[PDB]
Design an enzyme around this catalytic site. Sequence first.
Site, short mmCIF file in Angstrom:
data_model
loop_
_atom_site.label_atom_id
_atom_site.label_comp_id
_atom_site.label_asym_id
_atom_site.label_seq_id
_atom_site.Cartn_x
_atom_site.Cartn_y
_atom_site.Cartn_z
N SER A 196 -11.87 -14.63 -4.85
CA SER A 196 -10.57 -13.94 -4.79
C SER A 196 -10.43 -13.30 -5.94
O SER A 196 -11.29 -12.18 -6.22
CB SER A 196 -9.37 -14.68 -4.44
OG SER A 196 -7.94 -14.01 -4.48
N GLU A 323 -8.15 -14.46 6.25
CA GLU A 323 -7.69 -14.06 4.83
C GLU A 323 -6.21 -13.97 4.61
O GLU A 323 -5.55 -14.44 3.61
CB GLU A 323 -8.49 -13.24 4.18
CG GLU A 323 -9.99 -13.46 4.17
CD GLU A 323 -10.26 -14.07 3.13
OE1 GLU A 323 -9.53 -14.35 2.29
OE2 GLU A 323 -11.61 -13.96 2.83
N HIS A 436 -7.84 -18.24 3.53
CA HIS A 436 -7.99 -17.86 2.03
C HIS A 436 -8.17 -19.06 1.21
O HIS A 436 -7.06 -19.65 1.17
CB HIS A 436 -6.88 -17.00 1.67
CG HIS A 436 -7.43 -16.23 0.19
ND1 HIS A 436 -8.25 -15.26 0.34
CD2 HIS A 436 -6.64 -16.57 -0.96
CE1 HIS A 436 -8.32 -14.84 -1.29
NE2 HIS A 436 -7.46 -15.65 -1.85
#
Length: 527
Positions: A196, A323, A436
Amino acid sequence: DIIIATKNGKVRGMQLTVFGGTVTAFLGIPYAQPPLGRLRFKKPQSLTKWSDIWNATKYANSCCQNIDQSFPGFHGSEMWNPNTDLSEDCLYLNVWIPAPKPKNATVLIWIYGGGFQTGTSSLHVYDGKFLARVERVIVVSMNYRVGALGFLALPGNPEAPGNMGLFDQQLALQWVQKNIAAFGGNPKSVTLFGESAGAASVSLHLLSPGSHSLFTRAILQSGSFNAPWAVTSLYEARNRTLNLAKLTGCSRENETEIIKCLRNKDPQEILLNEAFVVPYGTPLSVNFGPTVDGDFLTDMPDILLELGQFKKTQILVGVNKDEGTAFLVYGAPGFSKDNNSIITRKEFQEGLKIFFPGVSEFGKESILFHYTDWVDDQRPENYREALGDVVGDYNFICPALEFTKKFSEWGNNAFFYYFEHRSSKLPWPEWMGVMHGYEIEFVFGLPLERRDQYTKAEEILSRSIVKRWANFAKYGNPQETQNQSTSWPVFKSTEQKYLTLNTESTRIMTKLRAQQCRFWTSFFPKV
Ligand SMILES: *[C@@H]1O[C@H](CO[C@@H]2O[C@@H](C)[C@@H](O)[C@@H](O)[C@@H]2O)[C@@H](O[C@@H]2O[C@H](CO)[C@@H](O)[C@H](O)[C@H]2NC(C)=O)[C@H](O)[C@H]1NC(C)=O
Ligand SMILES: *[C@@H]1O[C@H](CO[C@@H]2O[C@@H](C)[C@@H](O)[C@@H](O)[C@@H]2O)[C@@H](O[C@@H]2O[C@H](CO)[C@@H](O)[C@H](O)[C@H]2NC(C)=O)[C@H](O)[C@H]1NC(C)=O
Ligand SMILES: *[C@@H]1O[C@H](CO[C@@H]2O[C@@H](C)[C@@H](O)[C@@H](O)[C@@H]2O)[C@@H](O[C@@H]2O[C@H](CO)[C@@H](O)[C@H](O)[C@H]2NC(C)=O)[C@H](O)[C@H]1NC(C)=O
Ligand SMILES: CN(C[C@H]1CCN(Cc2ccccc2)C1)S(=O)(=O)c1ccc2ccccc2c1
Ligand SMILES: *[C@@H]1O[C@H](CO[C@@H]2O[C@@H](C)[C@@H](O)[C@@H](O)[C@@H]2O)[C@@H](O)[C@H](O)[C@H]1NC(C)=O
Ligand SMILES: CC(=O)N[C@H]1[C@H]([C@H](O)[C@H](O)CO)O[C@@](O)(C(=O)O)C[C@@H]1O
Ligand SMILES: *[C@@H]1O[C@H](CO)[C@@H](O)[C@H](O)[C@H]1NC(C)=O
Ligand SMILES: *[C@@H]1O[C@H](CO)[C@@H](O)[C@H](O)[C@H]1NC(C)=O
Ligand SMILES: [Cl-]
Ligand SMILES: [Cl-]
């Protein structure tokens, strides 16, 4: 008793038992002067040698940060929250070396994510002892400053030049360069990996000239610098640094007198005010983040990418199947982790306003139109699933794919994965899918511990990913060659081949999210 002489002094480690073997952990080795007092907001300064034996036997302070207090007592959220004391004195790193001390081991450097606002290397899912144990790599992770304290910018002004958290990271890579040989590591074989905002960070290190020679290869999980949240505009960065100055009563005409004033505030005053420097926050607001400072970053990264102005090397890039779903329960109306979150058309439209607050009616209408041409209009999960894909496709998948095309177009080998396994112990609800951040425990080899309630098929998947990641670090090629594993082809801009990662079958597929990313990467930027 294992003492290693670094260039700045002796450090003592500890011994771990992992899988009937031994890893030596050095936790909390300082790599900079503590950025305290007049040093707040400035680039990290080099460390003065010490004469004692520094005891690197527990994780160090995490950097100051605001905490996710949205789901108190829920492991799904609180597992991401700092597990050491917060302090401005947080520039420390960790080293896991195999036992016995290796000879010339490949080094893995982990850069954590957190929106550039949150995170810490001491998290349980960033524990590098399994990788050291199983693949005989050295794993390094570092704490870097976040929030205003790491990314405040009066650009051109060295008292707050911006990008300090990136310069923190860079000074840590530099430390690995000068000292990892003493630990048995090969400074010529250093692979950066991160997730990320960590992955956005790794990608900016490909562009930064001062990082070119501090690493070999790069792995980007669920993130890249061209993601819409990754790089702050030098306009907004100034507008935000100014809004904080007004919020703390530090407004001055001499911009430097502003920094001095902000340096006599308590960290808690700076933290409580960060969320308000932007007029319309979203669950994905990077209030203070990477900027074009003229030092770490010399031009807009989109331009650098397009014109081949990066370190030429192999990249491993990838994204998870769902995600976007995590952010839906942080503001989107009709959403909760504690029900199935069936929302209406009108609730979907309201969700766009939460996530696209400064976008026109026509631009929001245009997201609705490309994501609501249903096969079966009567499926009630239609709108709930559409909003998750909107957030994931726009914020993660499409920029990660566009980064891999652009980078590979300049000759380098690139490998793209699509992680589509939902952890059997995952504490968020099922409609949230392959979330995510929930590939990280697999990358770090946590399902290899049988005591940890993962299924056997999960242990097999983690073991395979750990082999593929280590073979990419060592050899630039993320294959598993012994067991009859699917060969992982290079991602070319023509055919755009990628590898699925799941417990059932590992497949090779083509042109991920192709209809969706044409909208996001071509039409939508014009709105
Ligand atoms: C740094 O460590 C040394 C060595 O002790 C080791 O590390 C400790 C954290 C603990 O886990 C010990 O069991 C380890 O063996 C420390 O040396 C000790 O110092 C105290 C007082 O200075 C003394 O009474 C003890 O006898 C010493 N030895 C042991 C085995 O405890 C040292 O103090 C540590 N220094 C710092 C600054 O933390
Ligand atoms: C640049 O900043 C101004 C000022 O920000 C406002 O005051 C700050 C101290 C802080 O509290 C912010 O949250 C405020 O928004 C922005 O001007 C504001 O814009 C909004 C709508 O966009 C409006 O409703 C406010 O009344 C405005 N306030 C003032 C004092 O003008 C401006 O929008 C920012 N620029 C960008 C591009 O976001
Ligand atoms: C799913 O839950 C959301 C969240 O509402 C809260 O959490 C629930 C699990 C329950 O404990 C409620 O008491 C809470 O209000 C629901 O969203 C709310 O919906 C009501 C009526 O539709 C509305 O007045 C509120 O503004 C909504 N709150 C938020 C934060 O959006 C939602 O209705 C639930 N839907 C389903 C299908 O279960
Ligand atoms: C406030 N935060 C966001 C909340 C929503 C997710 N929650 C942590 C989590 C993570 C995985 C699964 C469940 C929960 C925290 S944040 O971490 O500061 C942040 C800010 C901006 C970002 C922009 C792009 C990408 C990531 C960003 C992260
Ligand atoms: C590969 O698979 C191993 C178990 O499978 C058995 O052993 C291998 C080496 C082959 O001989 C096969 O015919 C057997 O069925 C695992 O123990 C090992 O960890 C796996 N390795 C990786 C990298 O995934
Ligand atoms: C975390 C922090 O900020 N400071 C220190 C903590 C705490 O202050 C105390 O345990 C009281 O909580 O203790 C040490 O001194 C210790 O003797 O192990 C180490 C660390 O530097
Ligand atoms: C480690 O590997 C590099 C090549 O990658 C080599 O040049 C270097 O001399 C080696 N050093 C040791 C101590 O093995
Ligand atoms: C701002 O103040 C600092 C410290 O007093 C000084 O060094 C600097 O020259 C000043 N700049 C301006 C433009 O007044
Ligand atoms: Cl409908
Ligand atoms: Cl289109």
